[PDB]
Structure 1
Amino acid sequence: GLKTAQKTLFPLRSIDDVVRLFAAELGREEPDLVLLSLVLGFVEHFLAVNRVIPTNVPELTFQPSPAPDPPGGLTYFPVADLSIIAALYARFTAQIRGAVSLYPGVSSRELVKKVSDVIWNSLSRSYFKDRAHIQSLFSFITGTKLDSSGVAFAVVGACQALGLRDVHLALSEDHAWVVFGPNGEQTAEVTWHGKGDRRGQTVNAGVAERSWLYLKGSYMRCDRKMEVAFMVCAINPSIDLHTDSLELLQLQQKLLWLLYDLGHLERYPMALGNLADLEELEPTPGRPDPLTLYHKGIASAKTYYRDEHIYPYMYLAGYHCRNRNVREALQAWADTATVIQDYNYCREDEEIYKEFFEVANDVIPNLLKEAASLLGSALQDPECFAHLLRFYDGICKWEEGSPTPVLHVGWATFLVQSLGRFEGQVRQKVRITFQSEKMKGMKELLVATKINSSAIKLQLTAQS
């Protein structure tokens, strides 16, 4: 049953009606995660899954009369009636409350597994786990489909609906599970990970193996407010690969600012980075500019998570790169590799591997080609060259002694090209200490007047 204070806010006819519902729920000790996620999923379904009116803008013509069709296209909002949303809410709570007095303010491992099994066993047996728009309880209720972290959110939402206030969402930079118990020290896997589960297990073994997936234990223990922030970050504006709903972007943006003003992103580095990326494209007057927010996310990760997160520096580097700040982008990537070098590359870390691959083999090559077209230039600065080498040193040190290889011949092709962007007289100016055995073993090749492509390929692809 929905409280009477929640009912009065309906119907939701605009983004700001949604913002006030979130504003009202965040003021309470337990924001209703189920209600909020259903509303977002309903809105997302009718703005992105079943797009009622296309986003096409007609060809810019002019004439004395008005245009036959709205010349800039249309934005819209699907009205969210209380009857529709309350009915879906009642469906979910009727499901969970009926499915789980056996368990007498701490939750047992047995209880957490049962709630987790209720969600798990409701899911469709065959669907594509990486589709868009299957993150919300609206998707669970109306489609019985959830993506990987959506399972974990739904398990937490189910635990809240049974009054299990010690069960919270735990988040790494690519995985989700639950924490519970007297001091939040109990852990349980509740979903699968990767393109291929450990359900029921603790995360002790993943923390001990020092994989990026478990962040060496420096992962996010959410409270109820950070769980709202997660569902907001989980909004997917994509209508197709090349088209985002303006409405859903604007909704996510205003909701992130709402959480920001209430202080609920203080320990959420990726949320601050996501907000900065939104401000970069659609700046809000009177708000901090994106660089301020990127540095807030880095400071958050230093303050609360031992500076063991990767993405805060990737957010910053990408912004510098898109704004042609070559020195600052290369430095931020050198800082990114400086964090990863203390991790072991394990079999479930493909996501951060893919981001590093894109940086090394597409983003940096483009940044350097751009700088060469301009050509003081960054390609004439030995500090930029040294930042490039430190980036590769961190990657090599990451690989070194890891159970999974990192560098392959394709990486060496782009390294040789990037080295070539710096003239030999520039490269011969650096005097650097490397950490990785791989980079130590080719320091001389990196600063030689002629770049020996075949020798660098051999060295970069040497085993371990």
Structure 2
Amino acid sequence: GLKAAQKTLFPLRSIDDVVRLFAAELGREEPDLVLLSLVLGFVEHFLAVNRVGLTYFPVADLSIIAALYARFTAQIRGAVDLSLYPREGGVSSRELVKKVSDVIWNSLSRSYFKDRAHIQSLFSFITGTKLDSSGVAFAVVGACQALGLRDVHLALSEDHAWVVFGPNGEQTAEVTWHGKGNEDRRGQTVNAGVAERSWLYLKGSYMRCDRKMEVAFMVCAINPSIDLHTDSLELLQLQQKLLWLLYDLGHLERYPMALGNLADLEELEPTPGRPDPLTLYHKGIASAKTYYRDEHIYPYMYLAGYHCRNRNVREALQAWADTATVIQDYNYCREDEEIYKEFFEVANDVIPNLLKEAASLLEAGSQGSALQDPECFAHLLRFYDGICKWEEGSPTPVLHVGWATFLVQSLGRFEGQVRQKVRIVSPVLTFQSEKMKGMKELLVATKINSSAIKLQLTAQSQVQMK
């Protein structure tokens, strides 16, 4: 049931009309997640999924959008009988949250590619009966709001989504799947994951959204991809404009990833009179420091990626060292594979490529090169120190001999007279990991002893018998 006041801006004929609808909704006591997700999904469908007939912008008529809204509300209200789940204190019960989750779940097509683009919004849920993992969580939160359950909110880590609810918003419930081939814990709390200090649950320093942050989530969720080679400029512009709206209203304050996404967009196409990408990456880091105990990994990866693309080797290594300094106080657990993949790619592909080019440019006479800077060698060492410390105490190991080949190569990119300048104290650098402490003498030697490095990084007990 859309209110008269919600309907007055239709039809939406442009990017800017969509921005106005968002502004209007964000100025209400409770922005309407269902309306907003349906609108975003409609426009994304007609700008990215099917552009046949497109001449400027896919006009969103009130009759179309209101009928989609009706389909959603009718589906939820008919399947979830609230009288069966008495609410005291204006708060929801775990049984009610589970029932809403089941309703969304049981609505989805039995089989589909769960990784596909453009299956994030309630437009996809209604028209395609498909949602991606975090899409299911969002749709549970949208359904709860539709039912009047003001206490149910989206919880987000850097790789997963669930809900919070209940007295003081203190309860957690799983409502969707995570990854592939994992067993789901739907209906359960996230306490076991928090207690094991996995990255997936951020030691409890995950995001607890209010309604405005849930709008920011749907905006981050917009996917401009038309195919592998092509983005919709219209959706990029829309996402960028909506992110700025949210930024100006204060609603990205506690949302590091959204700041990084806005920085990435500003790199591609800067908005005149706005902060530089670097300023925005730093605001993302500051957000993580202020609200989340500096326990997030991606704020530093966003920054490192920016410096990497710009071939600022020194600053990229600094930011990846800072990324490792966060991961060192985690336990590498089952289901943390995404972050392992990210670190593996940085160590074993991205850094090698950067240093290879740097070596060529040094041969060509570069001055101020990262390869002649002992502070950059220290950053490389701190990056490996955090990865080795991560591994300590973890229930599954991180390092192996594939990593050792690249470490030897990367060390070897720095001359001994540069490496010798780093002072490893118990540029000055302190190691936290036992692996790097035992490697200290090997690191500053004129010739790099590759076999001894390999043995130290992988703690291999023995060398070839015969």
How has the CA–CA distance of structure 1 residues 311 and 17 changed in structure 2, closer, same or farther, with 3 Å as cutoff?
Answer: same
Shift of 1:237: 1.0
Shift of 1:370: 2.8
Which has the higher mean CA deviation after the structures are superposed, 9-18 or 205-214?
9-18
How has the CA–CA distance of structure 1 residues 242 and 409 changed in structure 2, closer, same or farther, with 3 Å as cutoff?
Answer: farther
Shift of 1:102: 2.6
Cα distance in 2 for residues equivalent to 1:184 and 1:85: 32
How has the CA–CA distance of structure 1 residues 118 and 289 changed in structure 2, closer, same or farther, with 3 Å as cutoff?
Answer: same
SS in 2 for 1:239: coil
Shift of 1:190: 0.3
Shift of 1:325: 2.1
How has the CA–CA distance of structure 1 residues 255 and 463 changed in structure 2, closer, same or farther, with 3 Å as cutoff?
Answer: farther
Cα distance in 2 for residues equivalent to 1:358 and 1:7: 48
Aligned runs of 1:213-224 on 2, under 5 Å? 213-224=200-211
SS in 2 for 1:442: helix
Cα distance in 1 for residues equivalent to 2:78 and 2:131: 21
Which has the higher mean CA deviation after the structures are superposed, 445-454 or 383-392?
445-454
Shift of 1:83: 1.2
Shift of 1:31: 0.6
What is the percentage of aligned positions where both structures have the same residue? 100
Cα distance in 2 for residues equivalent to 1:235 and 1:463: 47
Q: Deviations over 1:368-401 (max 9, x none)?
A: 2232233222111111101100000100111122
Contact 2:155 2:209 in 1 (8 A): yes
Shift of 1:463: 6.6
With normalisation by structure 1, the TM-score equals 0.93
RMSD: 1.6
SS in 2 for 1:422: coil
Consecutive unaligned residues in structure 1, runs of 5 or more: 52-72
Shift of 1:252: 0.6
Contact 1:175 1:213 in 2 (8 A): yes
Cα distance in 1 for residues equivalent to 2:372 and 2:290: 36
Which has the higher mean CA deviation after the structures are superposed, 320-329 or 213-222?
320-329
Partner of 1:378: 370
Aligned length: 443
Cα distance in 2 for residues equivalent to 1:85 and 1:416: 59
Q: Which of residues 443, 457, 462 is equivalent to 1:460?
A: 457
How has the CA–CA distance of structure 1 residues 423 and 298 changed in structure 2, closer, same or farther, with 3 Å as cutoff?
Answer: same
Cα distance in 2 for residues equivalent to 1:292 and 1:336: 18
With normalisation by structure 2, the TM-score equals 0.92
Q: Deviations over 1:397-433 (max 9, x none)?
A: 1112211221222222221221111001111121223
Q: Which of residues 176, 180, 183 is equivalent to 2:168?
A: 183
Shift of 1:239: 1.2
Which has the higher mean CA deviation after the structures are superposed, 75-84 or 131-140?
75-84
SS in 1 for 2:197: coil
Which has the higher mean CA deviation after the structures are superposed, 403-412 or 3-12?
403-412
Q: Are positions 1:150 and 2:135 aligned together?
A: yes
Cα distance in 2 for residues equivalent to 1:8 and 1:130: 36
Shift of 1:133: 0.8
Cα distance in 1 for residues equivalent to 2:32 and 2:407: 50
Shift of 1:261: 0.4
SS in 1 for 2:22: helix
Cα distance in 2 for residues equivalent to 1:457 and 1:259: 49
Shift of 1:353: 1.1
Contact 1:75 1:246 in 2 (8 A): no
Cα distance in 2 for residues equivalent to 1:447 and 1:355: 28
Contact 1:237 1:245 in 2 (8 A): yes
Q: Which of residues 87, 108, 114 is equivalent to 1:129?
A: 114
Which has the higher mean CA deviation after the structures are superposed, 141-150 or 97-106?
97-106
Cα distance in 1 for residues equivalent to 2:360 and 2:262: 32
Cα distance in 2 for residues equivalent to 1:235 and 1:456: 45
Which has the higher mean CA deviation after the structures are superposed, 230-239 or 411-420?
411-420
SS in 2 for 1:288: coil
Shift of 1:50: 2.0
Cα distance in 1 for residues equivalent to 2:406 and 2:11: 55
Shift of 1:452: 2.3
Cα distance in 2 for residues equivalent to 1:463 and 1:403: 18
Contact 1:268 1:297 in 2 (8 A): yes
Contact 1:48 1:245 in 2 (8 A): yes
Which has the higher mean CA deviation after the structures are superposed, 381-390 or 450-459?
450-459
Shift of 1:444: 2.1
Shift of 1:75: 7.4
Shift of 1:122: 0.8
Contact 1:44 1:235 in 2 (8 A): yes
Q: Deviations over 1:318-340 (max 9, x none)?
A: 11222222222111111110000
Q: Are positions 1:413 and 2:400 aligned together?
A: no
Once superposed, which parts of structure 1, at least 4 consecutive aligned residues long, lie more than 4 Å away?
none
Cα distance in 2 for residues equivalent to 1:130 and 1:226: 24
Which has the higher mean CA deviation after the structures are superposed, 111-120 or 225-234?
111-120
Cα distance in 2 for residues equivalent to 1:266 and 1:135: 24
Q: Which of residues 344, 349, 355 is equivalent to 1:368?
A: 355
Contact 2:46 2:54 in 1 (8 A): no
SS in 2 for 1:240: coil
Cα distance in 2 for residues equivalent to 1:113 and 1:409: 45
Consecutive unaligned residues in structure 2, runs of 5 or more: 363-367, 425-429, 462-466
Shift of 1:74: 9.1
Q: Deviations over 1:100-158 (max 9, x none)?
A: 12333011111111111111111111111111111000111111111110000000000
Shift of 1:288: 0.7
SS in 1 for 2:423: coil
